[PDB]
Amino acid sequence: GDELTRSHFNALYDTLLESNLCKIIEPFECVEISHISKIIGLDTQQVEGKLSQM
Amino acid sequence: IKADKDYSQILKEEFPKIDSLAQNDCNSALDQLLVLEKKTRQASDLASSKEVLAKIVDLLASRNKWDDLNEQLTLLSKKHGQLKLSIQYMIQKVMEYLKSSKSLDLNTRISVIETIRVVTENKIFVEVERARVTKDLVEIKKEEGKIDEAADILCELQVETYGSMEMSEKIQFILEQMELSILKGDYSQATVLSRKILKKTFKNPKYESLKLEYYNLLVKISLHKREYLEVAQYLQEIYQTDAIKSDEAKWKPVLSHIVYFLVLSPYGNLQNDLIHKIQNDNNLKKLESQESLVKLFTTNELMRWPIVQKTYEPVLNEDDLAFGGEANKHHWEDLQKRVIEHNLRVISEYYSRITLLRLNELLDLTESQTETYISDLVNQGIIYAKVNRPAKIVNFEKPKNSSQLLNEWSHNVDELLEHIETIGHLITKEEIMHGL
Amino acid sequence: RDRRERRLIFGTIASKMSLAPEADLDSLIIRNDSLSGAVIAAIMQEAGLRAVRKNRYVILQSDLEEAYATQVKTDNTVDKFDFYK
Amino acid sequence: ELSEEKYIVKASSGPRYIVGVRNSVDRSKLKKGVRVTLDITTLTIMRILPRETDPLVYNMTSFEQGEITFDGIGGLTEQIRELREVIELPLKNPEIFQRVGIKPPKGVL
């Protein structure tokens, strides 16, 4: 409810996804995409696309 | 203030007459006494009104007329021209008879206390009086339970600025306030009340007792909020006082708690400084398990978690406060985390290319807790680590920028020049010594 | 002269001080005068002093009411002569 | 304090000067405001003289005394209370003026 809140929370979700992908990557040098997908709970293709975008 | 028509002689003349009138119901007696009170009030004589108020309150309380004494108190407080000292003395008499009320039940006490608090509401000459009455009220309330109402009625009073109180009782009121706030379950409010006292106050010999209770309450607050280093500092301040430091059987539990809570805290410059300072303490040597425990968490040497969890576990378990029951299960996990953090802080200082399997062997973390822990400690920013999961390698070393390399080379060359100068200046000295 | 401005500044001054819960500044600001931004603080100082005189350490409504009568009486002008209006 | 041996001192005459200090004067106690003594010829700081009291101020505070007391004043008892609540109370009880929150009064006209 309060349509503004949800319309903003979509972009908030995108920002949080980027931030979490930044946090898990920090203690790594050659991390595996499968492990990253397991930690974030996302899919390999979507994780790869988001990673390329960032 | 002077009466100019002093009634003291007239007062002692009329008092036996009123006592003779006091053999029966005091209605006429209280009427005549109120006439005397009016005479004194128009004369503005404090000394006469002292005994007038004392005798009338004693007469009303003797016949258990508190249901009328409250109304007489209200009327006399509202009386125009009544001397402030007279009201303070009479309400002092009321409280003094209240400790000797004995037969009075809860309703009479509650009504008398309410009348006293409303009468002395918003006044200066009866500040300490109202504070003490409210303390008695809050004791009565908390005896029956009702923690919320008692807690807020005591927390309404701000005792720091009462002024008329002496510095022996404001501290007591603050301590009672904090204790009731803790009982309510408002630790933030308890800490709020805590900063009111200033530590310079406790630097006195007579406040030795209150210091221990105040610091113990602070320790309880910080323990519930888990600021272990703050608990260690407060317990150190407890230890530094004479009454417990002199007594071996009293500082020994205090020093044991100090050791445990200093070891339970995470790393940091303050923790290292405090652990070194306590290690230098001579009283610690008398303790046997605590000295060894401090040795364990000070030496740059990896320790096995099961060895600690089966060696020092009994001595730690037989205790209170920390590692002392089911409610202290919250502490053992913290100790395991601290020992793992120490192991990593040692390995990163020594190792450079530790493999994942041996890293799990040393830390004893199963398989993934190791990577999780490494991630958390590097995210906070204590250690420089980088995992290589496909290769199963950890690069604990920090790559060195050219600035660091050249600064180290310059420092080495400077040390070399200084050493060659010292050698040149010692050669001549020894040549003189053995050329003689 | 605006009611909102006097309300705001009265509340600002009262917040730092020890106004009693049963004390209403709205009752004080019912009438629209030419009250300056300084007099409407010295009035509260006078009310505090009046409360201190009666040994009360928290100012009540009865002292705020009396303070208005002693710090702001008139500007004289012509209001002393009602027949002009 | 331009340097350890160069100071910018005013003069009662009015002109400013760049004056070298002596060797015994404690250089620490030399900030904006401290009165100093200047040698007439070479204009060199000599002493660290304390603050000044203008003679037209001592001539004001050194009035005789006055022998009348508050008893001598008659009729005026309420206004005496009003004046004393500003003259004596802030100077001998600055704690009620704190918890109540009143700003201490300055003037009594």
CB B363 within 8 A of CB B373: yes
Q: Measured between CB atoms, does D106 come within 8 Å of chain C?
A: no
Nearest alpha-carbon partner for C34 in C68, C2, C1: C1
Q: Is the dihedral of CA B305, B310, B312, B316 positive or negative?
A: positive
Does the CB of B84 have a partner CB in chain C at under 8 Å? yes
CA-wise closest residue to D95 among B163, A7, B62: B163
Six-digit token string for B332:
């053992």
Are A and C neighbours with ≥3 CB pairs closer than 8 A?
Answer: no
CA angle C61, C62, C67 (to 5 degrees): 95
The greatest distance separating any two alpha carbons of chain A, rounded to the nearest whole angstrom, comes to 43
Tell me how far apart the alpha carbons of residues B89 and B51 are, in angstroms, rounded to a whole number.
9
Evaluate whether C20 touches C60 at the Cβ level (below 8 Å): yes
Residues B18, B29 contacting (CB under 8 angstroms): yes
| Å between D95 CA and nearest CA of chain C | 11
DSSP for B110-167 reads HHHHHHHHHHTTT-STTHHHHHHHHHHHHHHHHHT--HHHHHHHHHH---TT--SS-T
Give the minimum alpha-carbon distance from D75 to chain C in angstroms, rounded to a whole number. Answer: 20
Nearest CB partner across the interface for B389, out of A23, A26, A31: A31
Residue in chain D lying closest to C16 (CA): D101
**Of C20, C27, C25, nearest in space to C60 by CA:** C20
Q: Do B84 and C58 touch (CB under 8 A)?
A: no
Pairwise CA distance, residues B363 & B343, whole Å: 7
Ramachandran category for residue B399: left, alpha or beta (phi over 0 → left; psi -120 to 50 → alpha): beta
Q: Which of B378, B388, B395 comes nearest A26 by C-beta?
A: B378
Phi-psi region of B215 (alpha: psi -120 to 50; beta: other; left: phi over 0): alpha
Residues of B in contact with D95 (CB under 8 A): 161, 163
How many CA atoms lie less than 13 Å away from D39 in the CB half-sphere? 10
CA distance D96 to chain B (A): 9
- Touching A: which chains, 3+ CB pairs < 8 A? B
CA distance C31 to C81: 19
Give Cα separations from B103 to B56, B95, B140, B289 (angstroms). 20, 15, 15, 56
Q: Is D98 on the interface with B (CB under 8 A)?
A: yes
Helices (H) and strands (E) in chain C, counts: 3, 0
Identity at B102, one-letter amino acid code: K
CB contact (8 A) between residue D98 and residue B161: yes
- B348, B372, B373, B386: best to mutate for the A interface, most A CBs within 10 A: B386
Residues in chain B: 436
Q: Does residue B207 come out as left (phi exceeding 0), alpha (psi in the -120 to 50 range) or beta?
A: alpha
Distance from CA of A30 to the nearest CA of B (A): 5
Please check whether residue B397 is in contact with residue B352, taking contact to mean a CB–CB distance below 8 angstroms: yes
Both tokens of B94, joined, read 């009321």
Find the length of chain C.
85
Q: What is the three-class DSSP state of B185?
A: coil
B369 touches chain A (CB under 8 A): no
Show residues of chain D in contact with C51, CB under 8 Å: 100
Q: Is D20 on the interface with C (CB under 8 A)?
A: no
Contact D38, D45 (CB under 8 A): yes
φ, ψ of residue C25 in degrees (nearest 5): -75, -25
Q: Do A and D count as touching (3 or more CB pairs closer than 8 A)?
A: no
Q: Is B389 on the interface with A (CB under 8 A)?
A: yes
Answer whether B292 touches A (CB < 8 Å): no
List, as own/partner pairs, every contact residues C23-26 make where C-beta atoms lie below 8 angstroms and the sequence separation is at least 24, other chains included: C23/C59, C23/C60, C23/C61, C23/C64, C24/C61, C25/C64
Q: Which residues of chain C make contact with B123, given a CB cutoff of 8 A?
A: 55-57
Q: Which of B84, B122, B123 to mutate to test the interface with C (most CBs of C within 10 A)?
A: B122
Burial class (CB in 10 A: 0-12, 13-18, 19+), B331: buried
C-alpha distances in Å from residue B148, one per residue of B160, B175, B187? 22, 17, 14
Please tell me the distance in Å from B162's CA to the nearest CA on chain C: 10
Q: Quick check: B122 contacting D, CB < 8 Å? A: no
What is the rounded CA–CA span in Å between residue D12 and residue B84?
A: 59
Residue in B75, B66, B121, B124 with CA at minimum distance from that of residue B95: B66
